[PDB]
Structure 1
């Protein structure tokens, strides 16, 4: 129906994921993941029973919280789909193995599962059980990973059942390395290293990147998924505006819990003293554009249009802020 028609844009940047969410009965992660696994022939390549894949995806999607405004199953589906597009960038053609592709997409699907809608710093400062378990270090990202893997143990949920032991071990390592890289406290280090990789990058006459060790290979997949995680401001403005609404709702709810506890309210979490426009422009200026500019450098000219959208959206958000 209408859903099958929308899913024809699955290989395009700016898939209307909110429409897909509505039309699928709030199963955007399941349908988009299923569509992408079919597209990349992943079920055949790894002997994944289709009923198994769907059971896992539905269980995974169930462990994203419906009452969390941003970090929910729609965000997960969005990051999966964005990673799916980035994987197909010309500069990376025939670079990654099918296992590495599977790792990147699976990592994207689980990378925020069971997110409580508050930040790592909130969990640390409120002495949460999660921060106690994980010794204040990548608290949520460690938990996403544990939950994501733990769900494979559900009945008929092991989508990796027909991988070799070696394949399982390699995939597990890559997925962990990738999801831990979505911790924003690692952003500046990831970016500094990505800049150095760009400075010294090797290609082939065909034109694709040369990555001849695990460290360079995982580094590209880490930044790729990190870019997809931070890809909202690079999307068509109608989509970006909705993401912005959701993240602010989530932040303000955290701010209200902080205010209730007599805590200092985190930056951008006070509904009474926050400029959405100023905050998006700062977010783009200091985080999203410096990253995407570097990714665009790596894969030049593949990401030119993405970078243009980002720059147009930045100019749009700053346009109503009075300036000298």
Structure 2
């Protein structure tokens, strides 16, 4: 069944990859096989002299540190965000906007961006006086931990995929990866969208309409918003995929709300399985978060995010129709 696995992976460059099928066919190794394929498609293994066995050893270790008993924030989500970022990096409006190291940073960041996620929110970890919130002083608690684990795993035997990067390349990549993953904290969404909007208004492009980003500050802001868009890309995918992602996030939400109920705390929004409307929540999610973000992105890359935006608007219409 490697030939159908191979056949599914030939669409690695397409929005709507069959990531769940790939997860099943690969023996629950979608992060490993999708990351491997993307590194080959972009020729990053010999651009950065990465030994293929070191790539696989690290990826398997990284994938192992995603929890198999969390419904959403697991290795399938990691693989999906990697692949969505990979596609957004190939947006024609961004042709060669980013160096090979900036490409490598966005892809690596996507792969590690949720590693060792416990399936509960930053606010839960804060309000419960968790060890993670104590270590990180209530500030981007999960995202700081995802980075620390992602980088620490490079120190395991035969796991340093960056061993042949120069010392300046490693320092630059580390900084970019940190900046990107910290930006995936949902509490920073509005600041990040405000900066994406400012870049839209002050946007400068060539005659073909390709974006011109001269400052590193602007380029990292685009990469931050890019991985944020990929993190929030479920409602923009084909509906058969999107509905599975909704099932999984609601499982996590409800199991957290149970804990907020058993411990006796205030139940987080959308986490009370006894007073939840899954469909109304998705429509509001799209209306207030996902669509404002993806329509600003589509403008920055105008008109290249039309097919993705079209799917999102189709899916919003469908979810609304499921509300009597």
TM score, norm. by length of structure 2: 0.99
For residue 77 of structure 1, what is the aligned residue in structure 2? 79
Task: Give the C-alpha shift of residue 205 in structure 1.
Answer: 2.4
Cα root mean square deviation, aligned: 0.6
For residue 288 of structure 1, what is the aligned residue in structure 2? 290
Offset from partner CA, 1:241-261 (integer Å, 9 cap, x none): 000000000010001111101
Offset from partner CA, 1:93-120 (integer Å, 9 cap, x none): 1111000000000000000000000000
For residue 66 of structure 1, what is the aligned residue in structure 2? 68
Distance across 2 between alignment mates of 1:90 and 1:264: 46
Distance across 1 between alignment mates of 2:103 and 2:207: 23
Distance across 2 between alignment mates of 1:261 and 1:44: 52
Distance across 1 between alignment mates of 2:60 and 2:7: 22
Task: Give the C-alpha shift of residue 51 in structure 1.
Answer: 0.2
For residue 205 of structure 1, what is the aligned residue in structure 2? 207
Q: Which moved more, 1:204-213 or 1:244-253?
A: 204-213
Task: Give the C-alpha shift of residue 208 in structure 1.
Answer: 1.3
Distance across 1 between alignment mates of 2:96 and 2:140: 32
Task: Give the C-alpha shift of residue 320 in structure 1.
Answer: 2.5
Offset from partner CA, 1:250-292 (integer Å, 9 cap, x none): 0100011111011111110011110000000010000000000
Q: How does 1:12-31 map to 2 (within 5 A)?
A: 12-31=14-33
Distance across 2 between alignment mates of 1:238 and 1:320: 15
For residue 187 of structure 1, what is the aligned residue in structure 2? 189
Task: Give the C-alpha shift of residue 204 in structure 1.
Answer: 1.7
**Can you give the 5+ residue segments of structure 1 that lack an aligned partner in the other structure?**
none
Offset from partner CA, 1:102-150 (integer Å, 9 cap, x none): 0000000000000000000000000000000000000000000000000
Equivalent position SS for 1:160: coil
Is it true that 1:120 corresponds to 2:122 in the alignment?
A: yes
Distance across 2 between alignment mates of 1:92 and 1:30: 27
Task: Give the C-alpha shift of residue 300 in structure 1.
Answer: 0.6
Task: Give the C-alpha shift of residue 321 in structure 1.
Answer: 1.8
**Can you give the 5+ residue segments of structure 2 that lack an aligned partner in the other structure?**
none
Task: Give the C-alpha shift of residue 207 in structure 1.
Answer: 2.6
Distance across 1 between alignment mates of 2:292 and 2:59: 33
For residue 144 of structure 1, what is the aligned residue in structure 2? 146
Offset from partner CA, 1:182-221 (integer Å, 9 cap, x none): 0010000000111011001011224311110110010000
Equivalent position SS for 2:10: helix
Q: How does 1:27-42 map to 2 (within 5 A)?
A: 27-42=29-44
Distance across 2 between alignment mates of 1:263 and 1:180: 27
Equivalent position SS for 1:9: coil
Distance across 2 between alignment mates of 1:141 and 1:94: 28
- The count of corresponding residues between Structure 1 and Structure 2 is 322
For residue 304 of structure 1, what is the aligned residue in structure 2? 306
Distance across 1 between alignment mates of 2:15 and 2:314: 16
Offset from partner CA, 1:9-65 (integer Å, 9 cap, x none): 100000010000000000000000000000000001000000000000000000000
Distance across 2 between alignment mates of 1:291 and 1:271: 28
TM score, norm. by length of structure 1: 0.99
Distance across 1 between alignment mates of 2:323 and 2:73: 28
Distance across 2 between alignment mates of 1:258 and 1:94: 47
Distance across 2 between alignment mates of 1:138 and 1:50: 33
